[PDB]
Amino acid sequence: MDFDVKDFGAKGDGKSDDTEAIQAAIDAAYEAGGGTVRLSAGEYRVSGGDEASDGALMIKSNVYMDGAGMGETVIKLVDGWDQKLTGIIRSKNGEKTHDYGIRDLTLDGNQDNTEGEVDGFYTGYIPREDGADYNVTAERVEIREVSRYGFDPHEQTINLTIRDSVAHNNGKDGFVGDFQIDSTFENNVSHDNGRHGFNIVTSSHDILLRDNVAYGNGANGLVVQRGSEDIAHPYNIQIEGGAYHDNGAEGVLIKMTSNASLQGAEIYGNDAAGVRVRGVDGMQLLDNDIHDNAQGGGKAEIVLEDYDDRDGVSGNYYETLNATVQGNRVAGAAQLLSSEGRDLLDGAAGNDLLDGGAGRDTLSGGGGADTFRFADRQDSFRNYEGDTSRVDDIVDFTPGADLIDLSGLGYSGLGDGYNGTLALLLNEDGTKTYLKDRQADAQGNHFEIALDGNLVDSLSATDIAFDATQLELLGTTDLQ
Ligand SMILES: O=C(O)[C@H]1O[C@@H](O[C@H]2[C@H](O)[C@H](O)[C@H](O[C@H]3[C@H](O)[C@H](O)[C@H](O)O[C@@H]3C(=O)O)O[C@@H]2C(=O)O)[C@@H](O)[C@@H](O)[C@@H]1O
Ligand SMILES: [Ca+2]
Ligand SMILES: [Ca+2]
Ligand SMILES: [Ca+2]
Ligand SMILES: [Ca+2]
Ligand SMILES: [Ca+2]
Ligand SMILES: [Ca+2]
């Protein structure tokens, strides 16, 4: 059931306030049980209501607004509006609005000629209560010149899809997904916004971010994060393809998140690290193309690190855990640090720092001069019964180029494996070389590292840093 805004008195002349006419069309479509509100090419001026939560236009269940195309149909806020306006198009607070959407139109926040925080598209039910909008679609929508958030789908929305859309020149974030669930952001561009290209926050989970592009933003290209409150972390965030480039901060930042994945993206020209991972439990960083970042200074293309929130709202320390970093092309240093559990950490052409922490890790440096750090004797060991399920292995150690950093472990040098020395040994068939502490500790464990290949004759004392002085002399990276 199609309704034309023109038939309800909308002028689309750039001067008349068409808010009531477009709302009438929306209400007629809703009362018929659903329909498409069509808008022909033209600039429609709209105004807010008594309160910020009134937005400007109130979309309703089973109503879809179809324009004549981005740039053709433009919905613009009136000159002189001076009130906070939370959603130029929005669904109602306190209602579980469903099966609605917007296509082929532009929202213009008119921040130049207005004052107050304005958001373009706002969805959701009630902050901090159970309940959700659901089945929400934005297709080929452009949102520009709002003073705060362009696309601002909010808590909670299930099965939001935003595809083939653009957010640009907004005051804060182009796209913000607040407690989005089972939702899809595909083939979008967010550029030249005041802060973030994309910001996934507030417990969002099962999100696919496929083939999105973020550039020229004042802050991150994409950030996935808990947010400032003590609430459940986001989880199951899959970022595939796209490009995150020339932003004012990190290209992609992921923090206080569980089961995040970043695969096949191009990440370049950012002012800070290309990829930064802070306190993430389950991180896959696969097959990306990462180069020419840290333009504003900084030593690393990729940073894996913890997130210490002990002085913050949660009181918790969050380790990065369960990391898989493989197949990336990285023209610069990767800092690949993780902790308890099995990590697979592959460096790239740069001079990388690798430390899988506790648990059995498999490390490779790739090209360049890499440092494999072992920070605790309990991070790589054989137990009293000879079980090797906690012995780390280094895949491609290159004597004369790479370095094993044992500077915190209190061994003196190579030797017979007793009295604080480590023994350099080959296995029976000559396929693996070991560094062994032959002295069991009180729990019966032996520090041990396995190295692929036969290195008993090529590996020497200058390939291992046994104390801080040796580390200063021999360290291969800018990261210690
Ligand atoms: O998490 C936030 O704080 C979130 O709040 C959003 O504004 C909400 C606001 O929090 C509140 O729920 C308000 O509720 C109004 C309701 O809309 C209606 O006017 C009712 O008569 O009174 C309620 C009230 O006074 O509590 O609705 C706001 C809304 O805009 O839906 C946004 O500001 C968001 O940016 C922020 O993160
Ligand atoms: Ca709603
Ligand atoms: Ca202004
Ligand atoms: Ca580990
Ligand atoms: Ca390397
Ligand atoms: Ca190397
Ligand atoms: Ca380990």
Residue 44 in contact with residue 73, Cβ under 8 Å? yes
Q: Quick one: how far is CA 63 from the chain centroid?
A: 32
For ligand 1, whether the C-beta of 80 sits within 6 Å is: no
For strands 180-186 and 205-210, give the pairing. parallel
For ligand 1, whether the C-beta of 52 sits within 6 Å is: yes
**Residue with CA nearest ligand 1 atom 30:** 53
Q: Which atom of ligand 1 is nearest to the CA of 86?
A: 30
Burial (CB count within 10 angstroms: exposed 0-12, middle 13-18, buried 19+), residue 304: buried
Resolution value in angstroms: 2.0
Residue 417 in contact with residue 438, Cβ under 8 Å? yes
Cα gap 347→300, rounded to integer Å: 12
The dihedrals phi and psi of 25, each to the nearest 5 degrees, come to -60, -45
Distances from the Cα of 78 to the Cαs of 25, 43, 115, 371, in angstroms?
20, 11, 11, 59
Cα gap 476→402, rounded to integer Å: 7
Residues around ion ligand 4, judged by CB within 5 A, are 338, 343, 356-357, 359, 361
Two structure tokens written together for 8? 């309800």
Residue 85 in contact with residue 116, Cβ under 8 Å? yes
Cα gap 97→26, rounded to integer Å: 13
Residue 31 in contact with residue 3, Cβ under 8 Å? no
Q: How far is the CA of 448 from the centre of ligand 7 (A)?
A: 10
Amino acid identity, position 408: G
**Residue with CA nearest ligand 1 atom 4:** 127
Picking from 80, 63, 175, the residue whose alpha carbon sits closest to that of residue 119 is 175
Q: How far is the CA of 53 from the centre of ligand 1 (A)?
A: 6
Q: Is 7 helix (H, G, I), strand (E, B) or coil?
A: helix
Q: How was this structure determined?
A: X-ray
Residue 180: asked if its preceding bond is cis (omega within 30°), the reply is no
The dihedrals phi and psi of 141, each to the nearest 5 degrees, come to -105, 135
Ligand that comes closest to the CA of residue 91: 2
DSSP 269-292: S-SS-SEEEEEEEEEEEES-EEES
What's the CA angle centered on 265, arms 122 and 284, to 5 degrees? 90
Residue 125 in contact with residue 53, Cβ under 8 Å? no
For ligand 1, whether the C-beta of 51 sits within 6 Å is: yes
Length of the chain, in residues:
480
Please state, as a whole number, how many other Cβ atoms lie within 10 Å of the Cβ of residue 123.
27
Cα gap 243→252, rounded to integer Å: 10
Residue 242 in contact with residue 272, Cβ under 8 Å? no
Cα gap 313→231, rounded to integer Å: 9
Q: Quick one: how far is CA 180 from the chain centroid?
A: 15
Cα gap 88→44, rounded to integer Å: 12
Residue 87 in contact with residue 48, Cβ under 8 Å? no
For ligand 1, whether the C-beta of 259 sits within 6 Å is: no
Sorted by sequence, the CB contacts under 8 Å of residue 51 that are 6+ apart come out as none
